[PDB]
Ligand binder design. Sequence first.
Ligand SMILES: OC[C@H](C[C@H]1CCCO1)Nc1ncnc2[nH]ccc12
Ligand SMILES: [Cl-]
Length: 167
Amino acid sequence: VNSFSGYLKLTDNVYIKNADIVEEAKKVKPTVVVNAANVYLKHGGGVAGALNKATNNAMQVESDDYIATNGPLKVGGSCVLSGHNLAKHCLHVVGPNVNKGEDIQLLKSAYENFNQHEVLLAPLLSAGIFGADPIHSLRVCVDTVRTNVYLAVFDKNLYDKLVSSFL
Ligand SMILES: OC[C@H](C[C@H]1CCCO1)Nc1ncnc2[nH]ccc12
Ligand SMILES: [Cl-]
């Protein structure tokens, strides 16, 4: 039993809800919140910009030190950093950004990072401003993640479409 509430259950392990991920994490304080990151950990917009704003830019300051030490992530890769005031940890995961010409096949690799964590709050990878088809991202999530994932969907019209179209 966990404290996630109001989710629709899609499979044995994937749950979904219409929610603002910033407000969800603040309420639940999950062990792991997933950020929709880029390889530079520059948290400018979309989920990333919103999560960073909620930390009063502490996420960005931590991220800049991480990059200065380690260099950029790989597309499809991840790193674990602090969750600041939102969660114990933030798993920064880089899904392909179609608006940059990145290979959509890397979306499965990106979701594989979730399997290193028993329970996660997360957005749909490569959705929103990353330019991929969200119905596709949900399908890859369900077919790749085996741990317990609670998916927050910002857009109301999008959430209803994912549920109604889910197989
Ligand atoms: O796939 C990531 C989605 C994409 C959106 C853009 C259009 C339809 O869905 N973004 C977010 N999902 C959940 N919480 C969020 N908080 C801030 C942004 C955000
Ligand atoms: Cl977005």
